[PDB]
């Protein structure tokens, strides 16, 4: 069985505290379609009840303590979260928990700190003299007390902040005596700083505490791996060290995927080198390819669709996806793949042998905030393709600027498997492709239902497969 991840949230979910309940309720249904892992949103207390979770306040509050004006998180209570994870496990699915280590917001109090303004466009360039600011850096967690952890956060655990409370100024403030961490991404000179209070990953108390929390969190929740937020903004050598610790101390392999958001493939290869292949990365450049192709009116050269992507260059470390909560309309990385192209992108990541694909909750269930209907009826037949048919040796036909395809011969121990896929960003047509001599004489049909004709395999193992305009067909053998 192929591995298939699902990102189990989107940005515009209502703040109604039901998501963990939905996970428990939907787990069996999802697993039956071949989903094997769920990436859950940050599950700990944010700056308010409605925070999506990246505005992390208290890593140890899983919707259990009366903090930031609520007990539950946006998603539910600690008990509902633990129950969600158990339900996924009963359905035979693994759970990857979102980990937010870049910054910390909603401090309980301020501290007076000598600081300097740096340029948002070049954080290596100081643009003021030293002056004293009132920074939101004091974290005491009075709702939790010392349950689980007695560790308190102060100014010196952070490299800087984005707000002076005394003069009410928005600036990127670097604390005097602190430096931006290295290595990090070099966009804007040094991209360590992102929002709220930025963690100083060179501080030993910070490193020890996050290790402490990592081990506690795995043991407490029974999760199976991690989605790491904002890794280009976090010292590169920190995560290999952290993961080695948490993996050894818990005795779990803890699959981990990092969000290194860049469309520059060489930046991703750099990160993977600097982290010794300890984690996979989201294939952001392939997301860009799908976005671009969807908007190009047929003019995109489909022969290039996976050129300079992680799916091509480093397939065992790629988590492939069509869209996520940041690429949704109105969001920070907005780059939304139009619905006409979306099933083709889904077929590309679901039926090919390269990479670990990830289905987006917002695509699957729809996004009511923008009146975006569910694509479940177009995605399900592709999940079935992956679950039952996408096995064995692949042959590639990325050989025409509209119509591209590939085949899977089927696996010697998954009887009935085998497929031939075609997608086109332009007019439809046909393509001869090799599915395997062993399929000579078999009749193949289009599992998507987009086409009603059939394709019979010739005595050499070749079939003349077909696809409609602007569409996808996934041809599989009759039983
Ligand atoms: Ca630092
Ligand atoms: Ca940072
Ligand atoms: Ca084209
Ligand atoms: Cl200068
Ligand atoms: Cl410095
Ligand atoms: Na510089
Ligand atoms: Na930092
Ligand atoms: Na992020």
UniProtKB/Swiss-Prot annotation:
Q: Where in the cell is it found?
A: Secreted
Q: Which residues bind Na(+)?
A: 159, 181, 192, 198-199
GO CC, sorted alphabetically, is: extracellular region
Keyword entries, A-Z: Calcium, Carbohydrate metabolism, Glycosidase, Hydrolase, Metal-binding, Secreted, Signal
InterPro entries, alphabetized: A-amylase_thermo (IPR013776), Alpha-amylase_C_pro (IPR015237), Glyco_hydro_13_cat_dom (IPR006047), Glyco_hydro_b (IPR013780), Glycoside_hydrolase_SF (IPR017853)
Q: Name one GO molecular function term.
A: calcium ion binding
Query: SUPFAM superfamilies from the entry?
Result: (Trans)glycosidases, Glycosyl hydrolase domain
How this chain assembles, per its entry, is: Monomer.
Q: Where does Ca(2+) 2 bind?
A: 159, 179, 181, 200
Residues binding Ca(2+) 1 are 102, 192, 198, 233
As its record notes, the protein acts as a catalyst of: Endohydrolysis of (1->4)-alpha-D-glucosidic linkages in polysaccharides containing three or more (1->4)-alpha-linked D-glucose units
Q: Does Signal show up as a keyword for this record?
A: yes
Amino-acid positions noted as binding Ca(2+) 3 in the UniProt annotation, renumbered to this chain: 298, 300, 401-402, 425
Gene Ontology process terms (BP): carbohydrate metabolic process
Question: Under which name does UniProt file this protein?
Answer: Alpha-amylase
Q: Where is this site: Transition state stabilizer?
A: 326
**Where does the record place the catalytic residues?**
229, 259
Q: Which family does it belong to?
A: Belongs to the glycosyl hydrolase 13 family.
Tell me which cofactor or cofactors this protein depends on.
Ca(2+); Na(+)
Q: What is its EC number?
A: 3.2.1.1
The primary location reported for this protein is secreted
Q: Recite the lineage of the species.
A: Bacteria, Bacillati, Bacillota, Bacilli, Bacillales
């Amino acid at each position: 069985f192929n591995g298939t991840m699902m990102q189990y949230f989107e940005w515009y979910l209502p703040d109604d505290g039901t998501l963990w309940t939905k996970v428990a309720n939907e787990a069996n249904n999802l697993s039956s379609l071949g989903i094997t892992a769920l990436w859950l949103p940050p599950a700990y207390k944010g700056t308010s009840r409605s925070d999506v979770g990246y505005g992390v306040y208290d890593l140890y509050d899983l919707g259990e303590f009366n903090q930031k004006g609520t007990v539950r998180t946006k998603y539910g209570t600690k008990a509902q979260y633990l129950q969600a994870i158990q339900a996924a496990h009963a359905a035979g699915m693994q759970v990857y928990a979102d980990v937010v280590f870049d910054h910390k917001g909603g401090a309980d109090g301020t501290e007076w700190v000598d600081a300097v303004e740096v340029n948002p466009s070049d954080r290596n360039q100081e643009i003021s003299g030293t002056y004293q600011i009132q920074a939101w850096t004091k974290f005491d967690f009075p709702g939790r007390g010392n349950t689980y952890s007695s560790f308190k956060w102060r100014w010196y655990h952070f490299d800087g902040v984005d707000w002076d409370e005394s003069r009410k100024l928005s600036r990127i403030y670097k604390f005097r005596g602190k430096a931006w961490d290295w290595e990090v991404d070099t966009e804007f000179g040094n991209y360590d700083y992102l929002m709220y209070a930025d963690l100083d990953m060179d501080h030993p108390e910070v490193v020890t505490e996050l290790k402490n929390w990592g081990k506690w969190y795995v043991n407490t929740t029974n999760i199976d791996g991690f989605r790491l937020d904002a890794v280009k903004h976090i010292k590169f050598s920190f995560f290999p060290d952290w993961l080695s610790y948490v993996r050894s101390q818990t005795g779990k392999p803890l699959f981990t995927v990092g969000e290194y958001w860049s469309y520059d493939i060489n930046k991703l290869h750099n990160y993977i080198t600097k982290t010794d292949g300890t984690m996979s990365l989201f294939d952001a450049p392939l997301h860009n390819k799908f976005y671009t192709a969807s908007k190009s009116g047929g003019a995109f050269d489909m022969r290039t669709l996976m050129t300079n992507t992680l799916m091509k260059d480093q397939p065992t470390l790629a988590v492939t996806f069509v869209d996520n909560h940041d690429t949704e309309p109105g969001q920070a990385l907005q780059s939304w793949v139009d619905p006409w192209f979306k099933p083709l992108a889904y077929a590309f990541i679901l039926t090919r042998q390269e990479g670990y694909p990830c289905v987006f909750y917002g695509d699957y269930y729809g996004i009511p905030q923008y009146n975006i209907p569910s694509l479940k009826s177009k995605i399900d037949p592709l999940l079935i393709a992956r679950r039952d048919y996408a096995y064995g040796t692949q042959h590639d036909y990325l050989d025409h600027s509209d119509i591209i395809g590939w085949t899977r011969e089927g696996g010697t121990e998954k009887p009935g498997s085998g497929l031939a896929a075609l997608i086109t960003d332009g007019p439809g047509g046909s393509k001869w492709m090799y599915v395997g001599k062993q399929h000579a004489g078999k009749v193949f049909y289009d599992l998507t239902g987009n086409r009603s004709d059939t394709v019979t395999i010739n005595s050499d193992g070749w079939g003349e497969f077909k696809v409609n305009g602007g569409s996808v067909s996934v041809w599989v053998p009759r039983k």
